[PDB]
Amino acid sequence: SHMRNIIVKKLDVEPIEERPTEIVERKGLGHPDSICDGIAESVSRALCKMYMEKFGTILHHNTDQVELVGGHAYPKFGGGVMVSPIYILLSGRATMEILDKEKNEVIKLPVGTTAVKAAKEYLKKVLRNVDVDKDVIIDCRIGQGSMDAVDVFERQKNEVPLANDTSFGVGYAPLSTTERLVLETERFLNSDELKNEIPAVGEDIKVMGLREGKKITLTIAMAVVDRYVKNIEEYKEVIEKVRKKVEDLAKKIADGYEVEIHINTADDYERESVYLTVTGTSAEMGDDGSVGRGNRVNGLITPFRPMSMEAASGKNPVNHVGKIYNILANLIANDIAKLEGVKECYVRILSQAGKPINEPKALDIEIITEDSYDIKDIEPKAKEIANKWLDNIMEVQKMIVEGKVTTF
Amino acid sequence: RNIIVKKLDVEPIEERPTEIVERKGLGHPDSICDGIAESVSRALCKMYMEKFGTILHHNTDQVELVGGHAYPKFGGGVMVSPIYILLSGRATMEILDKEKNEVIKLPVGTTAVKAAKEYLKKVLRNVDVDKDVIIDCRIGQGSMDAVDVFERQKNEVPLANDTSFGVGYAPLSTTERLVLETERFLNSDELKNEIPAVGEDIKVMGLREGKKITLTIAMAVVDRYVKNIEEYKEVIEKVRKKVEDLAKKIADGYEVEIHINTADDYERESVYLTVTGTSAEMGDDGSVGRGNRVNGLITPFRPMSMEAASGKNPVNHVGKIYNILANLIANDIAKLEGVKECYVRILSQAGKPINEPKALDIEIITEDSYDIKDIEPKAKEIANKWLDNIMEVQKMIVEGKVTTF
């Protein structure tokens, strides 16, 4: 009986698959932009766990500022050289010290050391061929603010925070064939199973998908680790080996479509100018990176779907509307898309400033129905799903801190 | 050429119930970074042209602003901690004299730091670039394979540096024009000279619901020009009236509400006061490609590209060229009779000439009682016209005749 501003509307347009063209991009884990997103969010999570240990609540912070400066290297067949380390600057702000006037005590939290440690551990986790001791410099200019113990006491209540702004979030489901193919391609090429078989495949993998009717062209930029290819011959074999595996993958999840696969199209086998790297990432020299310039929270870049321009990674998981709403929108859309009769679902949430974040000014649910289905039969199920997620909005916070949802 | 044209049968933008549009003004920390990034690129282009008569490889689309600290006060406050800015990205740092067998270093560092400081002085009137701002530089040499692609056919038609897409659309909706022109007006020299209290950090958000547009402005006020809270209120109300008169010009028929600095607390005198005219002094951070698209707007009800045009080289970086190109094509197609709305998406393939996109995608919402088959060939010609004159895009960018944010 709790009445929210939820809107369910029938959408009478062509579903995504029936539209003639589609363009989808994904920047893989080792791409400099995705490295920065990953670090930003890993630092946030680390700081959250820090605050939770000491106070049992999360204090205010935002670490959605991370700059990766390309290093210096000299790739060579058989093994190249890393000349200058990658430089990474951690920025943002985080609550550092707590002033307690009553008991006359001052607590200070390991903001800087936690941040640097978290960033370094994330790099070790994803980049197989980067020695973080010598190949990376992690610097930190995160602001260290103070806070009254009184406000900490209020935070420990863990009530639903009030929306500090009029902001929005957007999501949709399900993923189209192209979207699924782009996503799973990057995931597969960065899976441990494949790396074991083809160690030459670096983590800096970028996948572009172009659908023309029922034909999908995949264009892949794949950084090759030079110590695993002793000449151009072996380099070529890596490309064709990967190609065949991606062909097999496309036949599993995009059967019925015509699939074309292009890899490292900028290569020139004649001049021996190819996508060769020492560390398996263009972060080593070729390409710089920063936060919020790549994937959206659903892990994709989709100019045929609605996209928020806000960078979710590193944002305050407590009271940043944009981050929470973009994740929540994608969680709601995903569940509604499972409902019988729903072919396509779009969710948009708009906050009411001054009101709890789970009491939005408007939540729009647009549904393309399957044939012979009545939107009015779906609507009550859909509104229930939305209200359920809104009721459990604090659990969504936990999911983020526990890394159970993606921010890029 | 791979030019695709489609009729798009959806509700036009103005007829949609809800519309949200944002613009970050020139003084906003994110737009500062975008502007600095492009200023560095333009400067390096000029420097390379002077020494070699050609533009050498670079991509300075990386600028990080770490917020400083300040202490604003009625009549004039003071900075406490300087604003740290890091110039980053790629550039041709040196050339090898194979004949003399010596490396010759190019003035990238001095050129970049100078271009950065000059831009700040141009967009932030009340900043002291000596004590308020620190500008560091870590621009480095680009990879060997990237420079190779850049040099393969620079003399002919350049080869795409990468596989990327830009987007564009036309025309602008009433809400979009209102947001865009609101910021531009308040950040115009004519206005700021009239009302020196108006800082350049102006964020404008437009929320349309039906035929009602709520215009929300966050405007930094320069504290040296407001002696008290009363004078502060006078600035707010004076700007408000200016925006009202503007709304009557370009948003006739719409109920336009105007909210300025909604977080202000007049009782506690806790308002949007600044020393420098930017929230960069308030510990707020900024970086490149976190704000406006090349059309100058953030538009979730429109298609967008995540590529950041600012700082990228105007020679072979499709992430810049195609976003500018898509906008140019969209504008022309929108002029055609029968075209209500136009959407242009241009995809590259790394290694292929920039005038040979993997796909040049066009969508058109036709006016009522208009055939797409009549408009279709008109659209292709416009697209072909521009691809034939793709080198003019570089020219327009280097000559600073187009915005990147």
Three-state SS string across B176-209, please?
HHHHHHHHHHHCCHHHHHHCCCEEEEEEEEEEEE
Q: Structure tokens of A316?
A: 């305050």
Where along chain A do its domains lie? Answer: 3-15+161-174+291-407, 16-27+175-290, 28-157
- The CA distances from residue A136 to A31, A113, A119, A293, in Å, are 15, 16, 11, 21
A148 among annotated binding-site residues: yes
B20 touches chain A (CB under 8 A): yes
| Three-class DSSP category at B126 | coil
Beta bridge partners, A144, equal A94
Q: How big is chain A by its Cα radius of gyration, in Å?
A: 23
Q: Where are the alpha helices (DSSP H) in A156-257?
A: 177-189, 192-197, 232-253
Considering only the beta carbons, identify the residue of A21, A285, A293 that sits closest to B306.
A293
Amino acid at B143: S
Closest by alpha carbon to B199, among B216, B176, B217? B217
Give the N- to C-terminal CA distance of chain A in Å, as an integer.
Answer: 35
Closest by alpha carbon to B294, among B32, B33, B56, B34? B34
Q: Which residues touch B130 (CB under 8 Å, ≥6 apart)? A: none
Considering only the beta carbons, identify the residue of A143, A275, A309 that sits closest to B283.
A143
Query: Which residues precede a break in chain A, with C-to-N distance above 2.5 Å?
Result: none
Closest by alpha carbon to A218, among A191, A253, A192? A253
Distance between CA atoms of residues A117 and A147, nearest Å = 24
Distance between CA atoms of residues A126 and B210, nearest Å = 48
Closest by alpha carbon to A315, among A323, A303, A305, A307? A323
Length of chain A: 408
| Percent of chain B as helix, strand, coil, to the nearest 5 | 35, 30, 35
Distance between CA atoms of residues A57 and A60, nearest Å = 10
- Which residue carries 């009254």 as its tokens? A148
Beta bridge partners, B59, equal B90, B312
Residue B372: CB atoms within 10 A of its CB come to 17
- Which residue carries 């702000």 as its tokens? A93
Distance between CA atoms of residues A287 and A280, nearest Å = 12
Please tell me the experimental approach by which this structure was elucidated: X-ray
Residues of B in contact with A362 (CB under 8 A): 18
Distance between CA atoms of residues B13 and B171, nearest Å = 10
Which is it for strands A276-277 and A215-225: parallel, antiparallel or unpaired? Answer: parallel
- Which residue carries 């049968």 as its tokens? B9
Residue B338: CB atoms within 10 A of its CB come to 15
- Which residue carries 């441990």 as its tokens? A192
Assess contact for A264 and A278: CB atoms under 8 A: no
Which is it for strands B212-222 and B273-274: parallel, antiparallel or unpaired? Answer: parallel
Distance between CA atoms of residues A371 and B10, nearest Å = 19
Distance between CA atoms of residues B144 and A286, nearest Å = 8
- DSSP letter at A140? E
A25 touches chain B (CB under 8 A): yes
Beta bridge partners, B257, equal B214
CA distance, residue B145 to nearest chain A CA (Å): 6
Ramachandran category for residue A387: left, alpha or beta (phi over 0 → left; psi -120 to 50 → alpha): alpha
Assess contact for B376 and B4: CB atoms under 8 A: no
Distance between CA atoms of residues B90 and A32, nearest Å = 13
Q: Structure tokens of A210?
A: 């172009």
Distance between CA atoms of residues B404 and B397, nearest Å = 9
The 10 Å CB-count burial string (b at 16+, else e) for B220-241 is: bbbbbbbeeeeebeebbeebee
Q: Structure tokens of B379?
A: 């659209």
Assess contact for A100 and A312: CB atoms under 8 A: no
| Three-class DSSP category at B155 | coil
- Which residue carries 């195609």 as its tokens? B322
A172 touches chain B (CB under 8 A): no
- Which residue carries 């430089």 as its tokens? A87
Residue A78: CB atoms within 10 A of its CB come to 11
Amino acid at B331: N
Residues of B in contact with A287 (CB under 8 A): 90, 143
